[PDB]
Design a binder for this molecule. Structure first.
Ligand SMILES: Nc1ncnc2c1ncn2[C@@H]1O[C@H](COP(=O)(O)OP(=O)(O)O)[C@@H](O)[C@H]1O
Ligand SMILES: Nc1ncnc2c1ncn2[C@@H]1O[C@H](COP(=O)(O)OP(=O)(O)O)[C@@H](O)[C@H]1O
Lengths: 322, 322
């Protein structure tokens, strides 16, 4: 394991920079040369590959986004195209590739490893969504959670004293975790997520009761994976009079400096990735499961869903809002 | 389990309010009457005990500190004095007591349960220190971590461009966790903690080398449990010329709104406390261990130290700083 490359792929997630830093510094500590691939898999195809030194990652742990950049590279689904990426790595003597991103990014990594036995690949779970098999938390989830709290606070702090209902749309893709943790965190009356069947009539009856008791500044928090905040508002207005602030929090949830949870998680997983490469491992995603740092094969990562939405935490939220 | 009391004891920790809220709302959901004890165990002795309603805990999840208040009540170490506290609860028909605080607070709770079979007691681990057996994280640790990051950022953002070394004193009592996570989080050159033997000469040789390479704004982060920032500075100056900003972060580390990690942890553990009371349990502290919500007997909590300082995370920090 003499040369490693590292790349960031998919949407930004706070802590990507910290993960790159840990890969680069850990590599060099172990006398491994490390190359940064810029613009995700696009850079891999364009040969936008450059040697990194200790100082290339200075002043990065606190930075949001990714100093390598990212792209969407849909042509990487094609085998012929991946051949060029594999040649750009191999001509450089690269023996290991670390990919930081979500589930889609991992698929690129699996293909590489299948199509070139000479390159070991390791995935690091850089996404806000919390939706990667075999890690309990992804790098960025904790940051995104606090970002949502802060955004909610500003919406309410800047609103009319008389606004009764804030319908706020959270990210998460197909996973309701962000909406659930954020909802509980801000004291939401209602949480709308793809894992629970949404009962509009119940939700509006709750709004209306509280509006009847003079309750102001109530919040419905909505995972984008279930519906948009505007559709929620439109659907509620089929029972009750309501539209008081539809808010789409949007891509800012991906921005901003990672929290300490994310910095530390990123750091542990970036170093572990390099350890695994040195140990001969391949085709695994790294994570934290039951408070242990672990590696799971991409096959198992993609074989199912690998554990439930926490319905009991959903229930606790609803109990606390009563 | 018809009546519960709840109190906060020891230093403030972000998320105490969220824990009280979860106890109160969960109790009432289950048709249990819940009484707030004000000023910790002092209120217990003064009979500063009042019925809470659903609304008594409104607008509290985001609030730092504790709306019940806290005290230090050293006389509670005396059995005769505890008799008065027990009588104030029993005369009210209180059947369960939830104590939120650190290890010292738990001791009060154990005694109560030993001295009055009619009151069940449950501890909730409200402290920044991270130093309670059988939970991996205490309520406030995550908040304190981010508070430290923010404080470090402001020290550096407001300093002379030419300051070379910031010696910053972190809380933690006898546990180095806060200093370790914060250190890694801010990219500290050095981390001084009670679990690792401090090598001053090594530390100064590292400062001096980097100062020689033109490195500015370096940080030594110091757990109060190992030494003060000023003693560290004095000890370093026995090898090298240095004193560039001694900073004692101080009690503010206990203040401020809990992070989402803390709000959610607090909430889960407050509800669990009430569940346990309803189930007949007593003399247990609740926690999160290996990502599972668990209850551990006070005897086991006080029997040892129950798991290591993470030397491997300490090592990773040092590797990343090189
Ligand atoms: N099935 C796949 N096979 C190969 N490459 C893929 C696959 N899915 C995604 N990728 C690569 O990963 C990039 C990012 O994936 P995407 O699904 O947008 O993000 P995420 O990593 O967050 O799931 C895509 O643009 C593409 O280059
Ligand atoms: N051994 C003990 N027996 C009975 N009460 C105790 C004991 N230790 C502490 N307490 C009670 O808990 C209060 C807070 O404890 P302290 O040690 O200050 O905080 P923490 O709960 O953070 O450890 C003390 O003022 C006292 O009332």
């Amino acid at each position: 394991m003499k040369k490693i490359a590292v790349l960031t792929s998919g949407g930004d997630s706070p802590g990507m920079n910290a993960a790159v830093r840990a890969v680069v510094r850990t590599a060099i500590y172990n006398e491994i040369e490390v190359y940064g691939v810029y613009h995700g898999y696009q850079g891999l195809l364009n040969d936008d590959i450059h040697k990194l030194e200790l100082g290339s990652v200075g002043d990065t742990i606190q930075r949001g986004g990714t100093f390598l950049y990212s792209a969407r590279c849909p042509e990487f689904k094609e085998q012929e195209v991946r051949k060029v990426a594999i040649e750009n790595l191999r001509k450089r003597g690269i023996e290991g590739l670390v990919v930081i991103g979500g589930d889609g990014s991992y698929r690129g990594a699996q293909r590489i490893s299948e199509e070139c036995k000479e390159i070991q690949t390791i995935g690091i779970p850089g996404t806000i969504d919390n939706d990667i098999n075999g890690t309990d938390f992804t790098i960025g989830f904790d940051t995104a959670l606090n970002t949502i709290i802060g955004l909610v606070d500003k919406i309410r702090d800047t609103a009319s004293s008389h606004a009764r209902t804030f319908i706020i749309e959270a990210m998460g893709r197909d996973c309701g975790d962000l909406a659930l943790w954020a909802g509980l965190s801000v004291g939401a009356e209602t949480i709308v997520v793809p894992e629970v069947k949404t009962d509009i009539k119940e939700i509006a009856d709750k709004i209306e009761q509280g509006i009847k008791r003079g309750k102001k500044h109530s919040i419905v928090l909505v995972a984008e994976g279930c519906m948009t905040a505007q559709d929620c508002q439109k659907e509620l207005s089929q029972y009750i009079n309501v539209d008081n602030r539809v808010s789409v929090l949007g891509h800012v949830q991906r921005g901003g400096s990672p929290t300490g949870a994310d910095r530390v998680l990123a750091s542990r997983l970036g170093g572990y990735a390099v350890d695994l490469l040195m140990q001969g491992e391949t085709a695994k995603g790294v994570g934290i499961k039951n408070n242990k740092i672990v590696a799971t094969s991409f096959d198992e990562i993609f074989d199912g869903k690998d554990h439930k939405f926490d319905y009991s935490l959903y229930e606790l939220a609803n109990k606390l809002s009563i």
